[PDB]
Design a protein around this ligand. Structure first.
Ligand SMILES: NC(=O)C1=CN([C@@H]2O[C@H](COP(=O)(O)OP(=O)(O)OC[C@H]3O[C@@H](n4cnc5c(N)ncnc54)[C@H](OP(=O)(O)O)[C@@H]3O)[C@@H](O)[C@H]2O)C=CC1
Ligand SMILES: NC(=O)C1=CN([C@@H]2O[C@H](COP(=O)(O)OP(=O)(O)OC[C@H]3O[C@@H](n4cnc5c(N)ncnc54)[C@H](OP(=O)(O)O)[C@@H]3O)[C@@H](O)[C@H]2O)C=CC1
Ligand SMILES: Nc1nc(N)c(C#CC2CC2)c(-c2ccccc2F)n1
Ligand SMILES: Nc1nc(N)c(C#CC2CC2)c(-c2ccccc2F)n1
Ligand SMILES: [Co+2]
Ligand SMILES: [Co+2]
Lengths: 159, 159
């Protein structure tokens, strides 16, 4: 099973300046629950965004996509193509924009946290992938995060 | 990955008299999308409840649990224990009450449809398993079916 998991503003922005312009603890907890124990695949730019003290993310097989044959990611496996990372029962692609678009053909699940933040898209932003009509979505109820922003969870699925 | 999928009344009833006592087309489409392409595992009574012209379910590896050593199910593998049935990257246990209870200790996901009909538990009814604290799931919003029933979807998981 290949799944994608991400949080986006209502505009579709997922990242800016190489980081993320919000932080919802409830989203962090949902991310940990869904990914724990499984393979996580991230792009090199996303690995670079994690502080060394928190990486690799515990209890998961950390995999980083890079075109650099000598790039070293301490605590992770570095692979030059996405297909080499798909050897577990369950694989979660955790970002960022480039790797979501690369992995979408392999994916059957999309776990989306929509953040109710008014964040118009700007040049250089990373964006969530566009989901065509093959994806069936089940929407959650708008919830309040202790950070003060509302959020809702989406579960998209396709055979 | 071993998942369970079922549709229940609020009371927990999933079946009566060899039948499912409602019609909810959206749930069938949901069930078809989640199980398609994968192994599906079902108890002998649930196999017997499918008219011959509908079984085996298309596009899926149909497995039937029975204690009858010489039980044949044209179009399905017959196995004598749940563990025999579990094999692929992804297996869905699709009923009924006896098989759900047998399979829950091996499950990491439950996909539940709750049907808002006041269907009380009568003796002999097949029941959904009750999920404890260790099962976390986003409650879906209520929806309205073209059958006239209100329903909602839960996606439970445990790490
Ligand atoms: N849920 C959310 O909101 C999330 C947001 N983000 C955000 O996303 C942003 C980063 O995303 P983005 O900029 O798109 O970068 P990515 O994280 O997608 O990483 C891009 C890098 O991946 C490698 N790569 C890309 N395509 C290939 C390929 N075909 N083969 C091999 N390697 C490949 C390259 O590494 P190299 O240069 O080494 O070759 C490339 O530079 C950040 O702002 C981050 O904070 C991240 C994850 C989650
Ligand atoms: N989502 C829903 O609403 C669903 C509803 N249903 C309903 O559920 C009902 C059927 O459920 P239920 O009566 O509980 O029966 P099951 O479908 O669970 O089948 C029971 C049979 O499974 C076999 N079996 C049970 N335990 C084991 C074991 N440990 N090892 C091997 N084989 C075993 C036995 O077959 P044998 O006797 O041959 O040995 C037993 O009779 C029907 O009304 C059906 O419509 C069904 C599926 C889904
Ligand atoms: N829903 C969802 N999906 C995700 N892939 C991520 C990620 C990531 C990359 C490891 C950095 C997050 C997330 C965002 C901000 C803070 C904490 C988080 F877990 N949230
Ligand atoms: N959600 C969910 N889970 C399930 N296991 C099942 C089943 C089954 C056994 C094949 C009969 C259904 C379902 C219910 C009524 C009609 C069609 C359906 F697919 N729905
Ligand atoms: Co599937
Ligand atoms: Co899991």
């Amino acid at each position: 099973m290949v799944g994608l998991i991400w949080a986006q503003a209502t505009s579709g922005v997922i990242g800016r300046g190489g980081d993320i312009p919000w932080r919802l603890p409830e989203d962090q907890a949902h991310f940990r629950e869904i990914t724990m124990g499984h393979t996580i695949v991230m792009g090199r730019r996303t690995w670079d965004s994690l502080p060394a003290k928190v990486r690799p993310l515990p209890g998961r097989r950390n995999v980083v996509l890079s075109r650099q044959a000598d790039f070293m990611a301490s605590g992770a496996e570095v692979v030059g193509s996405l297909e080499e990372a798909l050897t577990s029962p369950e694989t979660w692609v955790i970002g960022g924009g480039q790797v979501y678009a690369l992995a979408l053909p392999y994916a059957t699940r999309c776990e989306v946290t929509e953040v109710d933040i008014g964040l118009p898209r700007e040049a250089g932003d990373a964006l969530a992938p566009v989901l065509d009509e093959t994806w069936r979505g089940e929407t959650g109820e708008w919830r309040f995060s202790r950070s003060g922003l509302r959020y809702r969870l989406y579960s998209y699925h396709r055979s």
